Amino acid sequence: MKANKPAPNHVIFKKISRDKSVTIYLGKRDYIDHVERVEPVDGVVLVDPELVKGKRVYVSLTCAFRYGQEDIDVMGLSFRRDLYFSQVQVFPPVGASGATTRLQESLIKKLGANTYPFLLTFPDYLPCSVMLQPAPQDVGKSCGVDFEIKAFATHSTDVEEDKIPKKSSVRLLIRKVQHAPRDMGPQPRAEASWQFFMSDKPLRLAVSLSKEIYYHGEPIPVTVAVTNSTEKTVKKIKVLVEQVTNVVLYSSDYYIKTVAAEEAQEKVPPNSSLTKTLTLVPLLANNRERRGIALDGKIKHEDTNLASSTIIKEGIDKTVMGILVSYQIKVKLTVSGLLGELTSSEVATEVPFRLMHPQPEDP
Amino acid sequence: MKANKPAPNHVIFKKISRDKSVTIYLGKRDYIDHVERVEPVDGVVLVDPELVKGKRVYVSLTCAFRYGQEDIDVMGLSFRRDLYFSQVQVFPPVGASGATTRLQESLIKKLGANTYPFLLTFPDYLPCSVMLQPAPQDVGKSCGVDFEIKAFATHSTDVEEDKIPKKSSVRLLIRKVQHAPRDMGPQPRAEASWQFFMSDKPLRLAVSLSKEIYYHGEPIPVTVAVTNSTEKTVKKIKVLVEQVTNVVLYSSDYYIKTVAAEEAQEKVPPNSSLTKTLTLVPLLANNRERRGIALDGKIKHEDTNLASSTIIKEGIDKTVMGILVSYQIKVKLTVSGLLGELTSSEVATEVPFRLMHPQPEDPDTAKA
Amino acid sequence: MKANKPAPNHVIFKKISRDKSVTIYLGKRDYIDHVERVEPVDGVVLVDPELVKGKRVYVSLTCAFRYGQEDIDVMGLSFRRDLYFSQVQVFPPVGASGATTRLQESLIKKLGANTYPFLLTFPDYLPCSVMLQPAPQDVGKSCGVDFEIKAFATHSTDVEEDKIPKKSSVRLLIRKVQHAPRDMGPQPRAEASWQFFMSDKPLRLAVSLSKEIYYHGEPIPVTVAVTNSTEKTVKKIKVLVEQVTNVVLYSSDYYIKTVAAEEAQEKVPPNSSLTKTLTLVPLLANNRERRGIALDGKIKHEDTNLASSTIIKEGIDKTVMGILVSYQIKVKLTVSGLLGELTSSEVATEVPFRLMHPQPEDPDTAKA
Amino acid sequence: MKANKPAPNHVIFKKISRDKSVTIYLGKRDYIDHVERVEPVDGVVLVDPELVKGKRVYVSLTCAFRYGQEDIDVMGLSFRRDLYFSQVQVFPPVGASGATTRLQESLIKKLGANTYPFLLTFPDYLPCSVMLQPAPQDVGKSCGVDFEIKAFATHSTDVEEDKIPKKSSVRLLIRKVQHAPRDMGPQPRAEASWQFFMSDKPLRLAVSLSKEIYYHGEPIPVTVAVTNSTEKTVKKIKVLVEQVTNVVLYSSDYYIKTVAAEEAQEKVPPNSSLTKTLTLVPLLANNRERRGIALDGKIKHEDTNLASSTIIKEGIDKTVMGILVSYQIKVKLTVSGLLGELTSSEVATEVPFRLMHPQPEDP
Known about the structure:
GO molecular function (chains B, C): G protein-coupled receptor binding; identical protein binding; opsin binding; phosphoprotein binding
Function (chains B, C): Binds to photoactivated, phosphorylated RHO and terminates RHO signaling via G-proteins by competing with G-proteins for the same binding site on RHO. May play a role in preventing light-dependent degeneration of retinal photoreceptor cells.
Distance between the termini of chain A: 29 Å
Strand content of chain A: over 45%
Order of helices and strands of chain A: EEEEEEEEHEEEEEEEEEEEEEEE
Shape of chain A: elongated
Radius of gyration of chain A: 26 Å
Family (chains B, C): Belongs to the arrestin family.
GO biological process, one term (chains B, C): signal transduction
Number of helices of chain A: 1
Pfam family, one (chains B, C): Arrestin_C
Oligomer: homotetramer
Number of domains of chain A: 2
CATH class of the largest domain in chain A: Mainly Beta
């Protein structure tokens, strides 16, 4: 649904400039990021001998945080912040160097003599793809972190000044996806217990989670343990997955939305304890309203889903991340004290967990 | 318990002067004030043909702020300030005019030929009935705003000077009560946050109220939401209705008294959010101590209750109100940091609201 | 330069059919469209008694979007879409009706007994005159929205079928021009900020425009405010008026051309703010290249200029407009970070505005 | 104008609780803060033998940042943040200790046997007194940093719980004033030069300041040097002192107000250079509008003036300061290029400087 017109071998994406002088081919549009390493963007560019004659072609990788652009603002408020930039010359063959990777190696000996490789690496202090669009009930414009690959040809002129025509260039908007670190090791269970003293008699709530990290689509088995030693009854038990977004660059916007839930009108009277095991699966398809939450792509694109929990590297400033995504489990019990209105009291707690994509697989 | 000796038809109050020459009848003693309009004081006066012979009778409406020993002194004791005065001639029939209202119309054709009507209107820049009496622990004398209707006969003398004998006159102390208009402001909401010494986590308190205006006697459902992300524990939660009086005429006296209170009994352990819904009803009967607060009548009278929130009209000077009454909800949390004494720290916030009497039941349904 | 041979009284255009049987006269060739209302096309037709004997004459108004080789093809060449059609009978006098307007009234009593009036109105959901011709560097054929008035005579034949000879008919290609209504939106304002790689200081750009609507030829005073808190220097400041065309009927073609530009010559050193006020006037005469932009007439005609900003009426589908014209102001700053090539970075922003013709001079002052 | 009813010896402030059980005396209400050290708050409390019988009395120092309180907020938004707290027991004589300072020593042997001393010190990571009240054209509630001394008596009850009646306590709102460090050493001049190239021909502006630190009330001699090598003329020269406030705790509010100014319609045509020396003195009395700027006290109090430049100590987090005050000199030149409207172009620059109170004087 998103653009990047393929051509099969296995699956390679291409884009020609209006100029038709330069064409860019990429192995994929989504690049893996597993804390320790991050897939480099290797590919090739098909040039037109005479069209690119006299000029040179380049390819660049740029990460930028945006805020405002493409938004009905009474006073057009926009802000961009570059978090990374790297450029390489792809046309005039630099050095005797060639297809450092197999992808470009086969692509070259499959496209022609006018095919040249390029390789742009990602640093380890960059956030992953994050996007947000304020719902109607939300305040604060939309923002996000884009990763753009750009192939462009530059020629010089008499007036002693170079030119970078839009026509002779291609713009590819790739995405950086978060994947569980390779070789992690077994993980404990997310524990937690609370003691709500009502009239000094206590109402205990204990929440348990199998692992600390869950994959997108993977069911989350939440175990609730309510030990009602009070005189009141727990009329209901609500268990929902909450996503917490935190803009940390242009304006400190804040969001907490439910991306999964499962409520039940249970019954836990005095001197009685109950233990249930629910299962929730937070997905973007869960709700029709995609506004207000933090996705990894455009609200319209098909291959777009919920963003993965942010993973700030040791020693890095969180603001450099632009937007911060996190997940947790909220369990609210509706206690009932029939007398005045203590029967409305709804206590709650939360247990944090991480959400991301399946570990990477080796050859 | 308050005086104004009735006589039934439905319920009409009467008062004869010592002179027995003039008698005043009033439909009621409490007149409605719903921001947009205010019930006019219509009634009649029964005169004695020969006793009122040669002289004329009048009726007057006067609003005055007092500040001294006796808040009824119709002349002077400490400090008085007239906020309004209007007078009309009731005896010698002025014009062919007659019972402009049904009340006086039936009252006249039920009392006699010596019964004459009168009608005194209220302006829209006057405060309502407010009274205060300093408690022992209070400083500053008692004060209030009185509304007095007065029927009196005046005759002239040889020395070229008129006389207004006390005996040939009646003094009625009516009251102006506040009733809900038609539209009330937004839903009362407040949000507080605290970061204590040596702590990097917040303690949030959110207060919610159903409506912005509540009637006297109507229960106020307060919803408290404490999100304790701190290391300490909220040992207690106090919710009370506070009345704030502010004398603004002779001396800027100030008062804040609790007219209702609730101790929601449950705590909020660290790293856990709690949400409770209490219900308080501020009433005068709530406490035996009626000294120090702002009532709408005398501290002794039965039909006396708490004063309604002041409603200053647009463009009017607050000082013209004499005394200013207001209400709010105070929620204090007793946090506890076991170490030095941070365990005594008691944070608090308030959410204002309006209190008055039920909207006027005049939706055209009442066929008088 | 465009045809419609006049004849003075003030200025009236005429056209005779080859047949010489019918002649059409029009008060003008350009009709005003000010959002609320749109000038009706009134005029008269001069017929030749015997030449038009036995047959009837009509006049029709038709709005059509074309997309092909010749944007005048009254039948079909590539793609045509009728957006409106209305016809009236002008020869055999329908009803006792006559010159509903003064124009036809004087024209009739100045031409003869063979002069008959007609009046065709415009609906309020039609676009104005828009034309486009792809430049060499452009892709997508030419298109446009034509408004055609047609006077034609129809007679019948033995074979039971009517005939509409081309010879006995006239084709007038009028145009609908956009004129300011009465109220224009808020003052155009924009604010941008940039933080470049390895830099922690912001670069602010604020753009201001006097009004929201400007007339053709009227100078546009753009005020730029650059607050360079960065380490780099703004070597250049470019301010240009951009026209954005959007074909929305047969094929979604897209255009963005510069119809005005100014190179304010002054720089903004680091840690120093600068505020300049440029003035641009977007006109068709501005550039020799008229290909690729959206005009209101033929690329050759003299009285042809830039099209006015489209004004889609509330509740109407934009596609019904055929082509969409809009204007804006683009301000690009050429920052310079001497190190790798951050010195090439050219940031930019835009502020939209409306362009059209002077408000209709119909304030009751004009006594026609 | 501010309260703290004195009693002469030299000048000592007193305040009795409603309870009349405790009375607090303070040497002064404004305590000096010269980067290296900060005046400790020493004083005494006069108790009533039987009224304080059975209970103990204490005195505490507390620094807190506020935001919102006492403001017409549609949804009462308030926030308090404690930056420091220290408490001492003043009634039951702790240890054989006594008047550590002369102040309390004379005060005691001048008040009675019911007079007890106390001493509360200030840490070196606290901001000074700062207050702000948004003007009508301003957005964001009012805030500030308060320093409160509190004397209160506490007694216990049957229900096993202590009580701290409001009546038996006094609240003193002292202020921490910034004074130039003692023994600084000579300071250079605040220099700066800029080059505005118009059509490649330059227009130079150089600003000079005598010292780097100025005292409140002290005249600031600004020297402007315009070297107009351009074709246009500098029709005007504006020199103003700007105060820059920056809320850094509850919400990042921002302010820039002119607290002094001196404009002149000078004339500097092509190939000509001009050098002027203006003198501005930023004071609170300068303008009637005290709303929108950062003072050191209440907008109503007499002894209230402009806040001093913030001095963040090495290694401390600026957010801990609550509000950040700073000063600078802005010089805007109104150049005129008669042709289109280049004659409106108004260039500008700024030179920062510090503002505070006179150095401290030793015995």
